[PDB]
Amino acid sequence: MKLNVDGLLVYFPYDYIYPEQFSYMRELKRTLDAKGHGVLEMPSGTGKTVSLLALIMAYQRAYPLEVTKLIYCSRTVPEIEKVIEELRKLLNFYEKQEGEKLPFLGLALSSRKNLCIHPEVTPLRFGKDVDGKCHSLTASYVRAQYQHDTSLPHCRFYEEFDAHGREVPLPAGIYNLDDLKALGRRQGWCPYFLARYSILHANVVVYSYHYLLDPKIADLVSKELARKAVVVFDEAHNIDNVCIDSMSVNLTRRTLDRCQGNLETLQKTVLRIKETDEQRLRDEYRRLVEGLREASAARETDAHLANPVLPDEVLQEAVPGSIRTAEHFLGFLRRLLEYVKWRLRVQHVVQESPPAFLSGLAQRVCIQRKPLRFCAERLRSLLHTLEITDLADFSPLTLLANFATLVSTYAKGFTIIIEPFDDRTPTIANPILHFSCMDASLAIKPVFERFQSVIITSGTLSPLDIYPKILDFHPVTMATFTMTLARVCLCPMIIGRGNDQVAISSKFETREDIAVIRNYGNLLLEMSAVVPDGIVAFFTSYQYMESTVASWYEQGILENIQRNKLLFIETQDGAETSVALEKYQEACENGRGAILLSVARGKVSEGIDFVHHYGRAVIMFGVPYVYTQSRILKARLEYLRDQFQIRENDFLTFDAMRHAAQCVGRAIRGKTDYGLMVFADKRFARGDKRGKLPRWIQEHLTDANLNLTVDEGVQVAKYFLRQMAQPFHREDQLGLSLLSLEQLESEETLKRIEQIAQQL
């Protein structure tokens, strides 16, 4: 189907287009006309990705210069696979419509774990082990020696790519990770290195948040990215959390012991190599004194331990002569480790600012800020010059060096929290240091200042103004697309009263209440006896969920629930959790009721998607407020209040509502998909809490369903199921929720589409 959107031709791969999709296309085109960042909110299951890809391809075809390369940032590998499949289908539609294969190249980027073919590295269960083994088999120093000695360890996949894969770029097309692996096996090349080489040639590059948002990994992609590139973020509602985690550093006593052991081993190795050949240290000193640009710009293959976190200005300055000597720097690291351990010896929690800790270290250890600024560079040079292969054992030293570099340069927005006792078990001596970053916007700061435009979209974007404050920027367009439905596919209900009229709440004071647990058990039993097989229940915390399950089993109510439908409960281990999810899906496809009980912060709420028959019923047991005892959360709230005038309670409510919408918003996949939404909490009736829901969900939240009981909720669920299980025809959607080619040409339809969307 051909679409005329503001004079631009779009090849829609489907015979029909939603009006919301047309509005999304028009708004995205308007944003592209400004070459600026924009934030849009689109309901899930509406095919927003297809519209985005079609408009981007149309823009590239019309004006390649405006958008030289498309950048897509995702969350999980299945998302990348789905995006690749949809883009391949769109490209096939384009080729069929035009009759020729367009010179279009799309590529998906992943880690070496998802791109290794070497049989020795395959059985490794950890990506870090895979990376270390690959580095050992593909080290630049190892390769040169292997050139004169074939018996030396090597990886033919990278060698053949270097010898043969560089001259011939990949032909225009779209390749999946399995497709890349098959091509590498056919050609004897490594798909990871070939994909890295072909990034500059690929018109579209798709990868995850970690590959670009993390400053440690940013230069692995941003080096082949121009200023006119456009970056796309989908489901980035928790981008701030990812940036904080990337910028956060955690150290433990076992980490300190491992660092001490690896430092002793490194000193012994340095002494041994100096006895064997002292000239290497002199050559390294010459390289450092003459400039670090010579070594970094001449070996692109040594990017295993790249540290692009520091600004480019600091790179020019050389390492001070006091620590240029290998032994001097080893002693410096030893003194730093001893000082860190002595500071961690405190028996109470200490909250410090980076400037105060730096001043204390300078007073005690006589360590100035300037020598500590280049800690990462000196560590990288020392690790590179010693021909170290098994860098996995050296990870704690690298982590400590990166933490020291972060403290020495980055001060504002960071807090050092020293907790010698675990929050869960204070009786256990667990000395842990957290270098918590409260400024996630810095992680996205260069992206705004380098690329042409940034595209941000997510299904949970209820407040349109907090994100510009969170990311510290001013998006050009802030528009939310209201969802128009010919048939009501969602019935969100709030049940704050139990069977015994007990006030349902999820506050930690009322979490231990037996009455609330019994009311939840009765509600689940009635839902199993009434609602279809698909049942998912999101709790607030793992301990609360376990206590609730134990109380249900002791009371015996859970026995009848198991009699009605099979029960599956996730655990902390993801290996058995995947098996439990597979069993749940098989039972739901076998006609036997399966009930899932997960947490709003668990893996289910993160990267699990529900089909129409999987997302029949989603029940949120209370507002998922984060555990406030974490001083990191308190410090972040204080920093946000002192830097953005945002109350801590408001931020906690926003985060909890975002998590709830993420848990519930994945139960709808389109017009033909209908599901039940239940919110078992009286707190949701609060206007401030209720107002923090997505517009496409909040609009359908009828006030008649506000604060119902178990029986009323069951009756409403029965009515909704019976009404929405009736046979329906796609022809009825024409003119109301679905638009054909002729309906698009109607100006009244265009006016309705314009009225559907609202900008804020």
Added chain:
Amino acid sequence: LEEKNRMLQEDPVLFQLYKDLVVSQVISAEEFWANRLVGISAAFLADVRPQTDGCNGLRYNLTSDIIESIFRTYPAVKMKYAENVPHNMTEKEFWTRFFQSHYFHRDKENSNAAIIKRFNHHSAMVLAAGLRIALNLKKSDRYYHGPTPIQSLQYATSQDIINSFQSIRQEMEAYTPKLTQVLSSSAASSTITALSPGGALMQGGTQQAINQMVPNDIQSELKHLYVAVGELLRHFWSCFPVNTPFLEEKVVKMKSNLERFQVTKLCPFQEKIRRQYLSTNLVSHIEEMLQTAYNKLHTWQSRRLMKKT
């Protein structure tokens, strides 16, 4: 033999039929028997409870169905039963131990984790054991005159009929109601006589009680003979149409069996009527059916002979 004998005992009529067909050498037992020839629920633990009677009664009611469900869901229970019953311990002792063991009474983080693991294992075991054309007619007028045969529809004479149509049109144009001309005493008497019992309209009359003329034992014997003949003829017609050479031999054997049955059972029954001199022709229907079958077989044999000419 034991399996075959129990089938006869369950149905005495069939056993009587078996005796009349095999013992009387009408048919062989081989040919006689040639023609003659659960989901798993998760409630098996929660719903099944140790039943407490009025005075210290442990009514276990250990049905094999529940035991098989437990074995399917929990192979460990089956292994323990095999390795302990009945040498290491008795079945009742094993059940008592299971009731008293922590396996049944699963009922704090460790306890919650154990309960969750047990429930997940039970669900996984249950899931694993669950697997182990548009139509356009041409001549619609056939529906206008369907299975009704060609009637006596006769067209009248030429234009003179219209004149007759005029005559009635002129005859009833000036019409007046009449009362005396409608009925007469003689016509009323004739109608009464026609409607009187024994008249032409009152067709026939009373009949004879055939129920008392035929003894009930003779009625039961006739019913048994009817059932046997009907089954034999159903087997005979099942082969028809004969498309394979084996069907020819099977039909020949069926005819031989029918002849043997008629000689051994029908004929002595006939005299049973004839000795009682019952005027009811009950055997006449049997004779008609047997003769129809014999004529059909003879005609098919003649057709087969002609096809080979």
Added chain:
Amino acid sequence: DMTCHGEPSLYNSLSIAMQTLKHMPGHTSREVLIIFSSLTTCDPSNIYDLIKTLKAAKIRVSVIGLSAEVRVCTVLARETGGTYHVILDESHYKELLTHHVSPPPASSSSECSLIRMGFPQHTIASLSDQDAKPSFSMAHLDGNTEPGLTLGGYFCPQCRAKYCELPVECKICGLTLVSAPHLARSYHHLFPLDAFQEIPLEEYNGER
């Protein structure tokens, strides 16, 4: 007056129906109607293999659920060519039953064979005539109660089998004994009555 207990077993019922319908001729349509009250069922084996077997057997399965729509039942109905429905109330249930009364349209795989049938008359024997031969009905012989010795009735033209009920296929020779009104009883399906044009009384200037 039965007792409702346990859980439904769709797999066993479908297997029994397929076994019963296995011997049926291809030209005759195989239709299955299922009343599914509970939303969960227990299957001793994989139902999808049974679904494939039913699809190969060309059997139509229609399911009318009571509580809500079942994905497995919907897939089964779609693959078997039947229709899946959900009960809204008693009136909706009656409407669904009335709709399902009408024969489903014949698919492409439906056979077209020229079946032979007989139409015996109501042979009635008079005791005054010497040709009165009372005989028990074959259908009545199947019951435990003593069959009634009827003077006449219906006799099969193919094997002289006596039946007192029509339309009943003859058990002996397999001939389907029907009657002319029985055949014409479905002729209205052949020529459905098209809906008349609706014009309001005010806009219609004609006969009152």
